[PDB]
Amino acid sequence: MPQPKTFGELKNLPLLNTDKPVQALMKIADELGEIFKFEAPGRVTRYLSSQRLIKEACDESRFDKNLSQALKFVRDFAGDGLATSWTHEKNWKKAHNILLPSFSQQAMKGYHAMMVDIAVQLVQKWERLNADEHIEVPEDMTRLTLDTIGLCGFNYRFNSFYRDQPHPFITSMVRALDEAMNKLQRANPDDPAYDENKRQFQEDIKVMNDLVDKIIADRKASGEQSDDLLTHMLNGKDPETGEPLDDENIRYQIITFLIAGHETTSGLLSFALYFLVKNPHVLQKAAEEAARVLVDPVPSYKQVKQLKYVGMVLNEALRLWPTAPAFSLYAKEDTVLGGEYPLEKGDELMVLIPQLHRDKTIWGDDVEEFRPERFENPSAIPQHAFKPFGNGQRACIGQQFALHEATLVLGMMLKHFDFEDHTNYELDIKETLTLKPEGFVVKAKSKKIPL
Amino acid sequence: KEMPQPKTFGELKNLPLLNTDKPVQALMKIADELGEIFKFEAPGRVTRYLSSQRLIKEACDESRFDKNLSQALKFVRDFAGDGLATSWTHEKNWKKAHNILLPSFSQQAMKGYHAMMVDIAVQLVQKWERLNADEHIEVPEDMTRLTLDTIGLCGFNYRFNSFYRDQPHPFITSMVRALDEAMNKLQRAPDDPAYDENKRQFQEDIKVMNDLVDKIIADRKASGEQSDDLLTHMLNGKDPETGEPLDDENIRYQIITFLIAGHETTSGLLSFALYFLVKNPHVLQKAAEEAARVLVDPVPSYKQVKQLKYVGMVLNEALRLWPTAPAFSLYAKEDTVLGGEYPLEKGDELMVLIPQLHRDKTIWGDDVEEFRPERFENPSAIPQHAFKPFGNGQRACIGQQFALHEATLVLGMMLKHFDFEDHTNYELDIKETLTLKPEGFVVKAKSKKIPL
Ligand code: HEM
Numbered sequence: 019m020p021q022p023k024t025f026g027e028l029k030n031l032p033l034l035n036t037d038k039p040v041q042a043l044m045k046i047a048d049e050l051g052e053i054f055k056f057e058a059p060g061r062v063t064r065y066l067s068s069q070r071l072i073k074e075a076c077d078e079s080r081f082d083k084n085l086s087q088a089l090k091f092v093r094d095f096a097g098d099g100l101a102t103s104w105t106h107e108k109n110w111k112k113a114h115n116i117l118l119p120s121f122s123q124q125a126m127k128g129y130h131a132m133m134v135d136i137a138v139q140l141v142q143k144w145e146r147l148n149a150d151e152h153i154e155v156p157e158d159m160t161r162l163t164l165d166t167i168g169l170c171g172f173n174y175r176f177n178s179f180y181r182d183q184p185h186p187f188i189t190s191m192v193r194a195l196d197e198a199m200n201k202l203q204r205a206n207p208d209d210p211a212y213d214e215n216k217r218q219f220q221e222d223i224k225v226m227n228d229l230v231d232k233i234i235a236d237r238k239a240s241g242e243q244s245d246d247l248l249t250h251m252l253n254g255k256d257p258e259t260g261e262p263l264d265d266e267n268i269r270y271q272i273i274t275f276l277i278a279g280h281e282t283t284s285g286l287l288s289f290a291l292y293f294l295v296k297n298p299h300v301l302q303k304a305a306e307e308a309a310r311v312l313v314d315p316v317p318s319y320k321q322v323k324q325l326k327y328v329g330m331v332l333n334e335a336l337r338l339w340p341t342a343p344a345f346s347l348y349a350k351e352d353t354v355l356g357g358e359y360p361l362e363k364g365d366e367l368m369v370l371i372p373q374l375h376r377d378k379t380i381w382g383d384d385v386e387e388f389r390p391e392r393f394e395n396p397s398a399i400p401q402h403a404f405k406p407f408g409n410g411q412r413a414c415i416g417q418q419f420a421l422h423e424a425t426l427v428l429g430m431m432l433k434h435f436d437f438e439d440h441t442n443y444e445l446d447i448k449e450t451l452t453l454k455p456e457g458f459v460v461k462a463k464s465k466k467i468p469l
Numbered sequence: 470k471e472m473p474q475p476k477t478f479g480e481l482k483n484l485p486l487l488n489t490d491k492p493v494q495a496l497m498k499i500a501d502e503l504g505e506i507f508k509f510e511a512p513g514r515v516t517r518y519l520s521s522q523r524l525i526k527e528a529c530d531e532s533r534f535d536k537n538l539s540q541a542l543k544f545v546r547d548f549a550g551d552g553l554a555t556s557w558t559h560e561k562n563w564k565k566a567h568n569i570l571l572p573s574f575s576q577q578a579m580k581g582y583h584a585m586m587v588d589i590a591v592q593l594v595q596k597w598e599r600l601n602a603d604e605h606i607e608v609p610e611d612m613t614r615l616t617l618d619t620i621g622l623c624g625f626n627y628r629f630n631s632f633y634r635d636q637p638h639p640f641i642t643s644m645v646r647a648l649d650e651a652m653n654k655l656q657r658a659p660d661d662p663a664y665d666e667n668k669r670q671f672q673e674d675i676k677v678m679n680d681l682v683d684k685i686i687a688d689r690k691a692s693g694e695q696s697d698d699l700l701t702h703m704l705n706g707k708d709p710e711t712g713e714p715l716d717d718e719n720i721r722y723q724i725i726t727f728l729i730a731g732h733e734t735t736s737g738l739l740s741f742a743l744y745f746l747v748k749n750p751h752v753l754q755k756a757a758e759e760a761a762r763v764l765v766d767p768v769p770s771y772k773q774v775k776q777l778k779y780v781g782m783v784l785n786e787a788l789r790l791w792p793t794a795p796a797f798s799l800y801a802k803e804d805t806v807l808g809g810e811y812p813l814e815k816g817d818e819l820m821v822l823i824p825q826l827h828r829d830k831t832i833w834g835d836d837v838e839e840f841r842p843e844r845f846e847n848p849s850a851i852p853q854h855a856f857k858p859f860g861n862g863q864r865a866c867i868g869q870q871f872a873l874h875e876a877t878l879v880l881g882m883m884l885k886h887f888d889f890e891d892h893t894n895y896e897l898d899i900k901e902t903l904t905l906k907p908e909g910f911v912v913k914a915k916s917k918k919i920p921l
């Protein structure tokens with residue numbers, strides 16, 4: 019098996035001591051091909067980049083979800099929520115069974131009104147900018163996704179569009195994620211210099227726990243019923259065990275929805291708008307659809323489902339830059355991958371999603387071009403070739419939520435404004451646990467269409 | 470609001486307007502007079518012909534309209550069965566075959582068919598290399614030999630050997646005669662005893678097609694052999710949705726469908742392409758330059774065919790002016806308003822008149838009748854649903870990649886190996902069956918003496 023350059027006793031690990039580790043791994047995959055071994059002190063994994071091998075890795079009879087070191091550090095504040103739990107933990111299948119109906123396409127009808135609430139705030143903010151002011155795209159998109167998840171999740175308003183400094187919960191969550199991310203490439207973690215990081219980390223965990231535990235307790239005491247996930251979780255029972263989720267796991271699910279959903283979804287909208295302004299003919303196609311479909315001052319659920327080309331735009335943005343760029347697997351038993359790579363029980367795999375989506379044997383030679391028409395007929399796409407939302411029963415439970423919000427928001431943006439890439443922005447992808455175009459700015463000229 | 474309508478014939482309404490040898494060209498002329506939409510009434514049937522991108526982009530909204538079987542397709546269904554082209558979207562065998570066959574018709578799947586396409590293409594070039602001085606080429610006749618044999622080879626690994634014959638293989642004769650009868654039934658005013666022979670011949674030709682294809686399927690199952698053809702993919706394929714494979718009868722109908730739907734559309738494309746090339750010597754020279762620059766090997770590779778960008782533009786511009794499957798039919802899934810001024814009731818029918826759509830001046834400019842492949846220099850500039858030679862949506866042509874790879878490879882080789890002369894100063898005469906072709910189109914080919 020191919021393997022990149024080594025650093026003596028540290029093996030390959032210093033290769034990840036960079037601010038853009040996913041893009042670095044993509045370049046290694048370019049050099050070494052569909053699979054390479056990555057060794058560190060006390061850990062071996064294998065990075066997969068081809069549909070040929072990843073379709074086998076996605077065989078749930080042979081491989082199960084593994085917690086990457088990133089996910090392991092996130093579990094310190096995400097607990098045994100869906101994203102940071104092992105498949106064999108009782109609370110995964112319990113929460114999976116309870117929550118799946120509340121994330122279905124049919125369930126999006128009930129969240130649509132709250133999504134419109136925040137989306138109209140975004141449109142109103144941009145309508146109210148002065149001439150030669152500009153938009154900070156990922157910053158506003160993250161304001162929009164956080165508030166939408168907070169509203170649809172537990173009927174709480176972070177009011178991000180009223181602030182320069184976010185609600186203290188958001189600051190603690192972002193800083194907790196940053197510390198979790200920074201721990202990945204941190205040498206000598208027990209050194210006294212990181213004592214402050216550890217103190218701050220425990221403080222931010224309590225901030226998140228205290229607010230969510232308070233809202234859960236408030237909702238139980240009031241007895242009120244809203245259209246949010248918190249109500250569904252307070253009333254839900256696992257059909258298998260007959261048990262409901264307890265209050266602690268409910269808090270972890272709410273924290274998980276915010277962690278897993280806010281930056282992935284905001285990056286998608288940011289990357290979508292980036293590719294649109296860089297491809298004016300595609301923007302014109304998407305803007306025509308939004309104008310033709312969204313004939314009412316406020317979009318309906320039915321109208322959002324009609325934004326077929328906008329949906330294609332989002333899928334192509336997810337192809338080039340999937341904002342949750344990897345997931346991890348382990349072999350359930352000894353098995354042979356691709357007919358030439360023997361794997362022992364417990365061996366770890368990483369799916370490098372941006373490389374998978376550039377597999378020329380699947381997509382052709384023009385993999386770097388932004389062409390939503392690749393997704394004109396979804397059935398043409400081979401199995402396990404397009405995995406922006408993971409795989410199998412451990413796939414993204416929020417996929418329908420994410421695509422419904424992004425389709426609604428991008429449609430409204432394209433309905434109400436013309437956009438100008440006024441700085442000729444040079445793509446610079448910042449890496450946390452997710453991907454986003456850092457510093458992406460545009461000017462928006464209103465079409466003067468009322469809400 | 471008030472929809473235009475062409476002249477009427479009393480109780481026969483508009484129907485006698487189609488009792489002509491060139492009905493598509495007649496419909497195009499009516500569209501010139503009446504505009505983007507006109508109603509067409511016949512006893513027991515009303516439809517609406519659309520010609521503008523403005524209205525057709527709404528008709529292509531799959532949430533509002535689904536594919537309808539025209540009377541032409543209904544008559545073809547008598548021997549095409551519930552294959553993809555003559556089945557309703559709601560029939561179980563459509564979605565099943567659609568799911569199974571789509572991967573076998575992808576652009577990537579053309580790599581596996583390329584060798585068999587080259588086999589037939591080399592036979593075509595060899596025939597033209599072997600003509601004597603001042604002999605000429607019957608262009609649509611040879612193109613139809615080329616596409617029939619290519620589909621037979623890639624479809625079920627059977628050689629009709631059309632280039633060894635003046636009278637085609639009996640399957641082809643039966644298929645062509647069945648298609649002619651299906652077409653002739655459209656304007657036949659049917660139970661008269663004069664048509665008794667037509668009915669007997671029709672059932673005989675159906676039996677010929679069914680018996681041969683059923684035999685090849687049975688032979689393949691008994692042998693167990695695996696080829697690079699669609700028949701193998703269909704014998705081993707399973708719909709991911711239902712988990713079911715196609716049964717042997719539907720497989721036979723798919724094979725018959727590939728030959729019906731693909732042979733005349735694709736040969737007409739090649740014939741119209743060569744017509745426009747010899748009528749536009751500067752464009753022919755540009756395409757011949759590309760073929761010489763790209764096809765540096767005695768036999769073209771799949772990779773080289775993809776590099777024939779200008780040849781691809783030539784074919785698309787030929788498809789723009791004369792799309793060889795010139796119309797398709799739709800019905801309204803629910804009550805809807807088309808264009809904001811035409812109310813449609815559930816079940817109402819539409820016809821998309823593709824050659825008129827491709828002459829929409831609001832899309833293409835004022836020179837819509839000029840042959841300029843440079844229109845397709847950047848495909849992304851073309852608005853949505855403005856260029857639809859292969860239909861729309863999930864009911865679009867599944868053979869689009871097959872057809873364009875075939876036409877690009879063959880035209881590339883033709884331009885590499887020969888100079889062409891329009892030696893009769895051929896006057897375009899478009900014969901209409903269910904497809905369009907330049908009847909009597911002939912050329913002389915002077916070999917460049919480049920070996921294969
Ligand atoms: C639009 C961008 C989004 C992307 C690209 C994305 C991607 C992913 C991926 C790749 C996984 C699997 C990770 C793994 O296997 O380790 C996952 C899981 C998950 N996602 Fe998302 N996601 C998005 C939005 C959301 C939203 C909006 C929510 C919540 C409302 C959400 C909640 C979750 C949860 C709970 C899981 C764990 C599911 C389980 O294992 O049971 N995600 N997501």
Ligand code: HEM
Binds near residue numbers: 567732798859860
């Ligand atoms: C190059 C010229 C070709 C043209 C212009 C063309 C055009 C079309 C059009 C317009 C339709 C849609 C008809 C409707 O909506 O009723 C269609 C459907 C179809 N065509 Fe083609 N075609 C060509 C070549 C081929 C080839 C080479 C094949 C097979 C190898 C093929 C097989 C089919 C099939 C199976 C369908 C039905 C698809 C479905 O409804 O699922 N065609 N074609």
